[PDB]
Amino acid sequence: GRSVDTMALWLGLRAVLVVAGLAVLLQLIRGWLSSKSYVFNREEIARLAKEHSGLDYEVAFSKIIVELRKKHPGHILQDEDLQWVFVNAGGWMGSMCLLHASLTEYVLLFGTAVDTGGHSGRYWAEISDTILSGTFRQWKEGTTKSEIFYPGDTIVHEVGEATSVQWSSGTWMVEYGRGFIPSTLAFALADTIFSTQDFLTLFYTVKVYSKALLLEASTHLSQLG
Amino acid sequence: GRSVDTMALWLGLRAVLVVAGLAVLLQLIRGWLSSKSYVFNREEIARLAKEHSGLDYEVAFSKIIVELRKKHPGHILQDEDLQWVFVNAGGWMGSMCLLHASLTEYVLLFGTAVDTGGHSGRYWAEISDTILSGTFRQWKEGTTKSEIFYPGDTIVHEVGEATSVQWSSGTWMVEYGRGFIPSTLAFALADTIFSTQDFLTLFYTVKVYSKALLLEASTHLSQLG
Amino acid sequence: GRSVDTMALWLGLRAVLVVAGLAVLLQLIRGWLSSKSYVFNREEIARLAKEHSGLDYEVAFSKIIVELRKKHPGHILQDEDLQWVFVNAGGWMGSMCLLHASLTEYVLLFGTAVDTGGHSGRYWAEISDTILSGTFRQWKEGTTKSEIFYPGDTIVHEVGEATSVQWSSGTWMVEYGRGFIPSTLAFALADTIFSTQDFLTLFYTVKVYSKALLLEASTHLSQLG
């Protein structure tokens, strides 16, 4: 009767429960025990972006790239490899210009020229966004109220945290990520696979990521010999 | 030539047509013949929520939970099992606090602190939402115009109906569902599987559902002996 | 160590790269070499829609359908086969009324009664939208700025181009598509498969497409004999 169907549904739900829980456990294990060698730190990136947040955001972009190259030679992509690529993730749409990426860190310019919003993703990485222009509304898990952030502010999405994110048209920011960067890739690509079907954008995305990894390997080789 | 390719495409479309049609038919068969034993009714929930819709929505939440426990002992989750869980479904993002769930009914608090919107889902269940705060825009199938609803109003999403739904930031409501509740689960989880990749949220969701089912079974056992 | 994991990740990224690149190449090959026999042209559709864009959009809809039937008998669906069907694609939600479809062309009425937005899709087809009412914000790839278009304006989404699109509530337009129309179908259906789970909407969609193809075949047969 209804009791048997309730029992069966409960058994299936418990199966899904243990699957999802062990997936979370494996994410934690891969992340906490991942290597932690860092070229940048989030305070450096945030201070650099905040200093230029009063400029036009594209002038700021350029000045930030020049300063990052000056202070971290061999770790920022060259001009020929810079490209704006759409990012469809968690139900929102923006675009990125990747400057640096390794297994443990990334640096990029991010933003959107449309009003958009959705899920932030949940992964073993600490992400920080410093607003150059626009507005960034963040809604944290377990609460019924959200906060707006403005140019000059830095939002820190912490390890294992999930939020709702919402950007107004014309919102541009500098983003630094630290942790187990591969664990973000799935989230970064899901809407491309299951929603937009935009395989040229996927091509561009994996292309620039591979170029950033190759730059880091080349610099590591040149500095060890 | 083009005639043969047109014929082939038409054949494939007819295949998809009969597949989708028989899926709809099976949904109807599972739903209409599902059991219909009810602890609540939608008018009771709607009147209770409308009475408190002039309060702050969190005060209303608390008073509604207390009254539901008083009038339906053994059918509302205890305080230790109440939790705000994100809900990513149909392209929109909100959050729920489940109070009751069985095979045939559910009761929850729902809302969002971001502007969001998307598909309502289509399933064999009658859903009713009573607005405590915010605005709820509903766009029904087969029409070119939408309607806004305000605090104190109840929206009834009827069995087999599909709509577009849109909520402004700070919109909170009391939701009651009646029908074949499992048939909603797929819709409730799809964006988590194929968009957000947030497996800890999936864990939380199946956890609270399983707790609600266990409460209902425990109460059924205590009342039959 | 970290060097080996970096190498492995780079190898996997290169695999994804060549897969996506050859998918794009196959899309280009199927599209460029597809047949190019056309019943309409985009200037005709755009001029007809622009002429009536000062009317109420539903009066415009009707007058446009009457004129299209008068000028292209046997290529527009009859009244009994006209239906508003929800379209969930690329993270946005609208609705369409298909008037014409073949392997190489389509004509439909499109719009939304909710604020929505997302990815435009990327396929080997040239799409043109003439706004009857509302606003259409378009954000092109490789730029950090978007443009708003108003009633009477035509937006041309070109072959292989990807954009972000955003419509305000009450935005209605006339859409003409030219190219390899099947290559759009995946994008048109993805959110239904992986997000909304709305199989009755999928039924309606493949039903009207099949009816349009059958009309075109019937007219081709009646005109060749």
In angstroms, rounded to a whole number, what is the distance separating the alpha carbons of residues B38 and B46? 16
The strand pairing partners of B138, in sequence order, are B147, B165
Q: Is C85 in contact with C96 (CB distance < 8 Å)?
A: yes
Closest CA to C121 of A176, A192, A205: A192
**Residues of B contacting chain C (CB within 8 angstroms):** 1-3, 5-7, 9-10, 13-14, 16-17, 20-21, 23-24, 27, 89-91, 117-119, 121-122, 137, 139, 141-146, 160, 162, 164, 166, 186-187, 190-191, 193-195
3-state secondary structure of C74: coil
**Domain-wise residue ranges, chain B:** 1-33, 42-224
Number of other residues whose CB lies within 10 A of the CB of residue B218: 11
Closest CA to B159 of B193, B188, B184: B184
3-state secondary structure of C120: coil
Closest CA to A194 of C189, B86, C183, B187: C189
The strand pairing partners of A87, in sequence order, are A94
C125-133 and C154-157 strand pairing? antiparallel
Residue with tokens 């009342």: B223
Q: What is the dihedral of CA B58, B62, B65, B71, to 10 degrees?
A: -130
Number of other residues whose CB lies within 10 A of the CB of residue C194: 19
Q: Is B127 in contact with B174 (CB distance < 8 Å)?
A: no
C221 to chain A, minimum CA–CA distance in Å? Answer: 35
Residue A26 exposed, middle or buried by CB count within 10 Å (0-12, 13-18, 19+)? exposed
Q: Is B161 in contact with B125 (CB distance < 8 Å)?
A: no
CB neighbour list of residue B174: distance below 8 Å, 6 or more residues apart: B45, B46, B48, B49, B64, B107, B108, B109, B110, B129, B130, B132
The pair of three-digit structure tokens given for residue A200, joined into one six-digit string? 């040229």
Question: H-helix or E-strand containing C89?
Answer: strand C85-89
B94 to chain A, minimum CA–CA distance in Å? Answer: 9
Q: Is B145 in contact with B101 (CB distance < 8 Å)?
A: no
DSSP chain A: -HHHHHHHHHHHHHHHHHHHHHHHHHHHHHHHTS----S--HHHHHHHHHHTTTS-HHHHHHHHHHHHHHHSTTSS--GGG---EEEEETTEEEEEEEEEE-SSEEEEEEEESS-EEEE----SEEEEEEEEES-EEEEETT-S-EEEE-TT-EEEE-TT--EEEEE-TTEEEEEEEEE-THHHHHHHHHHIIIII--HHHHHHHHHHHHHHHHHHHHHHHHHH-
CATH-assigned architecture of domain C42-224: Sandwich (2.60)
Residue A159 exposed, middle or buried by CB count within 10 Å (0-12, 13-18, 19+)? middle
Closest CA to B127 of B138, B115, B116, B135: B138
Q: What is the per-residue burial (b if ≥16 Cβ within 10 Å, else e) of C127-153? A: bbbbbbbbbbbbbbbeebebeebebeb
The pair of three-digit structure tokens given for residue C144, joined into one six-digit string? 């950090």
Instruction: Kindly list the distances between the CA atom of residue C65 and the CA atoms of A113, C48, C76, C204, C211, in Å, as whole numbers in the listed order.
Output: 35, 10, 8, 20, 17
First to last CA, chain C: 73
**Which of B17, B18, B87 should one mutate to test binding to chain C, selecting the residue with the greatest count of C CBs within 10 A?**
B17
Q: What is the dihedral of CA C139, C145, C150, C153, to 10 degrees?
A: -70
Dihedral of alpha carbons B137, B140, B146, B148, sign: negative
In angstroms, rounded to a whole number, what is the distance separating the alpha carbons of residues A126 and C22? 35
Phi-psi region of B74 (alpha: psi -120 to 50; beta: other; left: phi over 0): left
Q: Across the interface, which of C115, C202, C220 has its CB nearest the CB of B20? A: C202
Q: Across the interface, which of B23, B141, B190 has its CB nearest the CB of C195? A: B190
Closest CA to C133 of C50, C70, C44, C204: C50
3-state secondary structure of C225: coil
Cβ of A200 within 8 Å of Cβ of C160? The answer is yes
The strand pairing partners of C97, in sequence order, are C109
In angstroms, rounded to a whole number, what is the distance separating the alpha carbons of residues A193 and A187? 10
In angstroms, rounded to a whole number, what is the distance separating the alpha carbons of residues C30 and A16? 41
CB neighbour list of residue B56: distance below 8 Å, 6 or more residues apart: none
DSSP C125-178: EEEEEEEEES-EEEEETT-S-EEEE-TT-EEEE-TT--EEEEE-TTEEEEEEEE
Cβ of C197 within 8 Å of Cβ of B142? The answer is no
Length of chain A: 225
Breaks (C-N over 2.5 A) in chain A follow: none
Q: Is B171 in contact with C211 (CB distance < 8 Å)?
A: no
Q: For chain A, how long is the longest CA-to-CA vector?
A: 73
In angstroms, rounded to a whole number, what is the distance separating the alpha carbons of residues B1 and B20? 29
Overall resolution, Å: 2.2
Number of other residues whose CB lies within 10 A of the CB of residue C73: 9
Q: Which amino acid is at A199?
A: F
Nearest CA in chain A to B171: A144
Q: What is the dihedral of CA A29, A31, A37, A38, to 10 degrees?
A: -160
Q: Is B88 in contact with B195 (CB distance < 8 Å)?
A: yes
The experimental method behind these coordinates is X-ray
Closest CA to A109 of A80, A130, A89: A130
Closest CA to B36 of A2, A10, A3, A5: A2
Closest CA to C130 of C221, C12, C44, C69: C44
3-state secondary structure of C90: coil
Question: Per residue, what are the HEC states of chain B?
Answer: CHHHHHHHHHHHHHHHHHHHHHHHHHHHHHHHCCCCCCCCCHHHHHHHHHHCCCCCHHHHHHHHHHHHHHHCCCCCCCHHHCCCEEEEECCEEEEEEEEEECCCEEEEEEEECCCEEEECCCCCEEEEEEEEECCEEEEECCCCCEEEECCCCEEEECCCCCEEEEECCCEEEEEEEEECCHHHHHHHHHHHHHHHCCHHHHHHHHHHHHHHHHHHHHHHHHHHC
The pair of three-digit structure tokens given for residue B74, joined into one six-digit string? 């053994």
- How many Å is the Cα radius of gyration of chain B? 19
The strand pairing partners of A21, in sequence order, are none
Closest CA to C126 of C164, C175, C76: C175
The strand pairing partners of C105, in sequence order, are C178
Nearest CA in chain C to A185: C13
**Residues of C contacting chain B (CB within 8 angstroms):** 35, 37, 57-58, 83-84, 86, 88, 91-93, 95, 102-104, 111-116, 169-170, 172, 182, 191, 194-203, 206-207, 209-210, 213-214, 216-217, 220
- Residues in chain C closer than 8 A to B167 (CB atoms): none
Q: Is B68 in contact with B99 (CB distance < 8 Å)?
A: yes
3-state secondary structure of C86: strand
Q: Is C68 in contact with C41 (CB distance < 8 Å)?
A: no
Measured at the CA of B37, the angle between CA B36 and CA B38, to 5 degrees, comes to 110
The pair of three-digit structure tokens given for residue B43, joined into one six-digit string? 């008018």
The pair of three-digit structure tokens given for residue A47, joined into one six-digit string? 């201070």
- Residues in chain A closer than 8 A to B182 (CB atoms): 9
Q: Is C127 in contact with C105 (CB distance < 8 Å)?
A: no
In angstroms, rounded to a whole number, what is the distance separating the alpha carbons of residues A192 and C91? 10
Length of chain B: 225
Cβ of A166 within 8 Å of Cβ of B114? The answer is yes
Q: What is the layout of strands, in order, in the sheet containing B136-140?
A: B116-119, B163-167, B136-140, B146-149
Number of other residues whose CB lies within 10 A of the CB of residue C27: 18
Q: Name the DSSP class of C72.
A: S
CA A33 to chain centre: 20
In angstroms, rounded to a whole number, what is the distance separating the alpha carbons of residues C64 and A58? 44
The pair of three-digit structure tokens given for residue C222, joined into one six-digit string? 């009646």
In angstroms, rounded to a whole number, what is the distance separating the alpha carbons of residues B121 and B163? 7
CA A80 to chain centre: 23
Give all chains having 3 or more CB-to-CB distances under 8 Å with chain C.
A, B
In angstroms, rounded to a whole number, what is the distance separating the alpha carbons of residues A119 and A90? 5
Cβ of A86 within 8 Å of Cβ of C119? The answer is yes
In angstroms, rounded to a whole number, what is the distance separating the alpha carbons of residues B52 and B177? 20
Backbone torsions φ then ψ of C14, nearest 5 degrees? -65, -35
C136-140 and C125-133 strand pairing? unpaired
In angstroms, rounded to a whole number, what is the distance separating the alpha carbons of residues B171 and B148? 12
Q: Which amino acid is at A7?
A: M
CB neighbour list of residue A24: distance below 8 Å, 6 or more residues apart: B199, B200, B203
Instruction: Kindly list the distances between the CA atom of residue B43 and the CA atoms of B51, B150, B173, B177, in Å, as whole numbers in the listed order.
Output: 12, 18, 15, 12
The strand pairing partners of C85, in sequence order, are C96
CB neighbour list of residue B10: distance below 8 Å, 6 or more residues apart: C210, C213, C214, C217
CA C50 to chain centre: 19
Task: Report the half-sphere exposure of B206 (CA within 13 A, side-chain side).
Answer: 21
In angstroms, rounded to a whole number, what is the distance separating the alpha carbons of residues A115 and C116? 9
Q: Is A175 in contact with A128 (CB distance < 8 Å)?
A: yes
- Residues in chain B closer than 8 A to C221 (CB atoms): none
DSSP C28-65: HHHHHTS----S--HHHHHHHHHHTTTS-HHHHHHHHH
In angstroms, rounded to a whole number, what is the distance separating the alpha carbons of residues A71 and C189? 48
